[PDB]
Amino acid sequence: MNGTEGPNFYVPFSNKTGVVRSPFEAPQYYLAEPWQFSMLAAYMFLLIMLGFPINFLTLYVTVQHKKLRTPLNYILLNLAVADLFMVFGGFTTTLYTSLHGYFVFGPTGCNLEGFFATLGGEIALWSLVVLAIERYVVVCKPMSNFRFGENHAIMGVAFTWVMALACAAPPLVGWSRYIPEGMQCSCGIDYYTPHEETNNESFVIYMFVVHFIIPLIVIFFCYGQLVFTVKEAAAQQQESATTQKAEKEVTRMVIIMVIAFLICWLPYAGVAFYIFTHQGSDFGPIFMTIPAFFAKTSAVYNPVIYIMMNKQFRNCMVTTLCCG
Amino acid sequence: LETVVANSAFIAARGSFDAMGEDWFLDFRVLGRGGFGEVFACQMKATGKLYACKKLNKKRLKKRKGYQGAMVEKKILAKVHSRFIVSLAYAFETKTDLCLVMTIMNGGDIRYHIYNVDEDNPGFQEPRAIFYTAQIVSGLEHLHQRNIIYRDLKPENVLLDDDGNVRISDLGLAVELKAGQTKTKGYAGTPGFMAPELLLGEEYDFSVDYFALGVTLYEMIAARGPFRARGEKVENKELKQRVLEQAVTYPDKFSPASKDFCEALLQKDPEKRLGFRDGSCDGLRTHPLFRDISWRQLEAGMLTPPFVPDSRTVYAKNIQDVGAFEEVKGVAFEKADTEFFQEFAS
Numbered sequence: 001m002n003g004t005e006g007p008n009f010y011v012p013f014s015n016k017t018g019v020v021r022s023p024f025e026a027p028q029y030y031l032a033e034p035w036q037f038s039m040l041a042a043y044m045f046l047l048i049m050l051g052f053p054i055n056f057l058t059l060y061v062t063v064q065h066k067k068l069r070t071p072l073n074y075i076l077l078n079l080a081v082a083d084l085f086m087v088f089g090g091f092t093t094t095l096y097t098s099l100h101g102y103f104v105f106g107p108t109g110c111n112l113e114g115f116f117a118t119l120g121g122e123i124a125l126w127s128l129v130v131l132a133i134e135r136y137v138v139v140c141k142p143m144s145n146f147r148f149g150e151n152h153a154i155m156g157v158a159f160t161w162v163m164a165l166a167c168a169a170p171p172l173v174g175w176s177r178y179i180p181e182g183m184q185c186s187c188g189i190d191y192y193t194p195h196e197e198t199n200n201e202s203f204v205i206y207m208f209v210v211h212f213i214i215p216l217i218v219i220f221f222c223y224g225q226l227v228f229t230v231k232e233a234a235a236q237q238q239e240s241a242t243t244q245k246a247e248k249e250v251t252r253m254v255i256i257m258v259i260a261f262l263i264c265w266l267p268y269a270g271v272a273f274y275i276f277t278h279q280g281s282d283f284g285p286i287f288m289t290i291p292a293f294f295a296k297t298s299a300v301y302n303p304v305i306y307i308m309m310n311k312q313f314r315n316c317m318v319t320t321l322c323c324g
Numbered sequence: 325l326e327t328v329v330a331n332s333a334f335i336a337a338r339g340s341f342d343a344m345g346e347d348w349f350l351d352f353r354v355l356g357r358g359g360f361g362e363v364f365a366c367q368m369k370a371t372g373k374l375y376a377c378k379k380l381n382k383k384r385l386k387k388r389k390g391y392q393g394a395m396v397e398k399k400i401l402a403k404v405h406s407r408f409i410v411s412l413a414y415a416f417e418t419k420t421d422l423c424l425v426m427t428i429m430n431g432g433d434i435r436y437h438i439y440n441v442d443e444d445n446p447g448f449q450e451p452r453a454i455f456y457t458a459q460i461v462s463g464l465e466h467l468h469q470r471n472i473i474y475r476d477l478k479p480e481n482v483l484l485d486d487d488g489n490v491r492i493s494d495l496g497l498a499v500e501l502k503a504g505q506t507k508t509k510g511y512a513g514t515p516g517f518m519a520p521e522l523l524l525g526e527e528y529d530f531s532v533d534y535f536a537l538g539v540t541l542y543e544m545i546a547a548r549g550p551f552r553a554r555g556e557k558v559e560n561k562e563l564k565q566r567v568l569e570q571a572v573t574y575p576d577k578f579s580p581a582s583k584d585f586c587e588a589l590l591q592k593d594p595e596k597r598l599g600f601r602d603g604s605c606d607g608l609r610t611h612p613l614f615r616d617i618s619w620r621q622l623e624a625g626m627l628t629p630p631f632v633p634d635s636r637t638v639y640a641k642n643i644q645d646v647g648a649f650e651e652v653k654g655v656a657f658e659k660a661d662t663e664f665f666q667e668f669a670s
């Protein structure tokens with residue numbers, strides 16, 4: 001193929017240099033370089049250093065202001081937790097492994113790390129979706145009047161978890177597998193080969209459709225509606241200067257929000273699709289590290305967008321930082 | 325913003341509007357954190373009309389043990405309706421909070437409206453204040469005629485509608501006395517809007533409501549409390565000392581008639597406190613302050629203020645001007661609590 005098949009590893013670089021072995025037993029330096037590992041380790045360290053404070057604050061501010069615990073805030077707390085799963089499941093592991101230049105926790109480790117990373121990222125993914133949904137229901141008013149309560153919020157949180165498990169759990173029971181991605185120091189889901197006996201082919205189609213295309217449609221729908229609604233609102237309220245500012249502001253914000261979903265998951269989808277359509281196109285594993293960089297950084301930019309850029313949260317945080 | 329987006333959604337509904345079931349009202353941003361739970365804007369499924377819903381959260385209720393206070397507010401507001409007192413439209417419960425859905429007053433509340441005219445405008449101009457005072461007086465009179473002592477009144481509980489007709493609101497710190505006792509003792513109302521008698525746990529009549537009127541009017545014109553400066557509220561013991569001892573100073577913003585009127589209400593001797601001396605609520609109305617007012621025209625809604633809030637732009641505090649209060653600290657509901665919640669629901 002365009003990689004190297006194994007029983008629990010899939011190096012996305014073809015064996016033709018006669019040095020491609022298991023990436024759990026051989027140090028990678030025949031498809032990577034020591035400097036690239038230093039940069040990898042640096043990048044993961046950064047993401048921990050930024051990601052942990054940002055997500056800690058999101059949880060923290062809610063605990064000290066009673067009134068912030070509302071139906072619409074469940075999902076925000078959930079987002080912060082999701083991101084932290086990615087930090088301690090993914091980032092820390094990848095930081096450790098990178099300095100050996102290969103994944104040193106073995107096949108079982110790969111399944112563990114891959115589970116926590118996938119779980120994290122998927123709860124995050126679906127969090128962004130649910131958040132957009134809640135915003136769509138409240139603002140765009142698509143169907144006749146319905147109340148939104150705590151119980152519904154909790155169901156929403158559980159639902160994102162279920163969808164995440166629906167992706168992270170299959171490779172543990174042999175419907176696909178976790179195998180090294182990137183510079184072979186992080187484990188993702190295999191998607192670089194079709195392989196019926198391990199069910200890789202069917203899974204890749206499932207992943208691309210259910211976990212990218214479906215989300216992508218929902219994101220576009222919700223935010224499209226939101227901009228439409230706000231423009232309309234502004235037209236009905238041109239006697240208020242504020243609303244005119246708001247329409248421009250909403251358009252700016254929506255662009256940032258849409259872009260943030262795109263950057264995170266489009267690389268994975270794009271690469272996966274290209275390999276599927278043109279099976280036999282070999283590229284280096286450094287190409288495969290590019291999607292991971294973008295995805296992992298969402299642990300920083302998602303809470304910045306969805307928490308920090310809310311007026312209320314800002315005020316409360318400022319109060320707390322200035323000794324209150 | 326996001327807070328602006330939430331405000332924008334409210335605006336969106338309003339724009340369309342201008343042009344039960346407990347899962348039957350579309351929820352927007354909160355307008356404040358009320359006495360107990362939140363008080364948020366909300367919308368009718370069947371008519372597409374905006375209401376405020378004062379929610380009294382089950383958690384916060386358990387914490388203060390505020391079950392008696394809730395039931396009182398229900399029964400009083402449910403019975404009392406006029407043209408200078410707000411109506412109650414629904415009382416239902418969810419599984420998380422008890423709901424009061426009350427009638428339109430989309431012009432914001434007087435406390436807001438002090439700052440919405442301009443934040444650097446301290447209170448209202450004298451004619452504008454006189455109009456609102458007259459309307460408040462009619463509301464107080466109506467309560468007193470049904471033998472109800474309010475024990476409170478404050479700017480934030482005087483709401484404006486879009487035409488600038490005001491009504492008093494909230495009768496949850498009130499008591500309806502029967503014909504047989506003309507006085508009662510107790511501690512009720514919001515501190516710094518409570519008369520000497522209340523703080524000392526002594527007997528009192530309708531006089532205390534007129535003390536509260538004085539405090540309200542003083543703040544209405546000068547944009548600060550009589551017993552503390554604006555954006556303050558000292559501890560209960562000190563505040564109590566202020567109410568009992570401190571002779572209020574009167575700016576030259578006032579006319580002589582308004583100075584004199586304020587002095588009469590902020591008197592700490594109820595016998596000398598104008599309002600119900602000689603059992604007349606119409607004796608108060610004879611004061612020179614009410615020169616501009618004719619009672620017949622007031623009652624017919626033919627008197628309007630100079631500043632009238634817009635009828636297409638909503639007014640009230642946002643979701644970042646809010647307060648907060650203790651929801652449960654690990655304290656799970658008892659059977660007793662559940663039985664009260666069921667009993668409350670009509």
Ligand SMILES: NC(=O)c1cn([C@@H]2O[C@H](CO)[C@@H](O)[C@H]2O)c2ncnc(N)c12
Binds near residue numbers: 358375480483
């Ligand atoms: N209870 C009511 O009817 C209302 C209370 N608020 C706001 O909610 C805050 C908390 O009670 C108040 O200070 C007002 O700003 C209101 N704002 C607008 N319309 C209303 N009908 C109310």
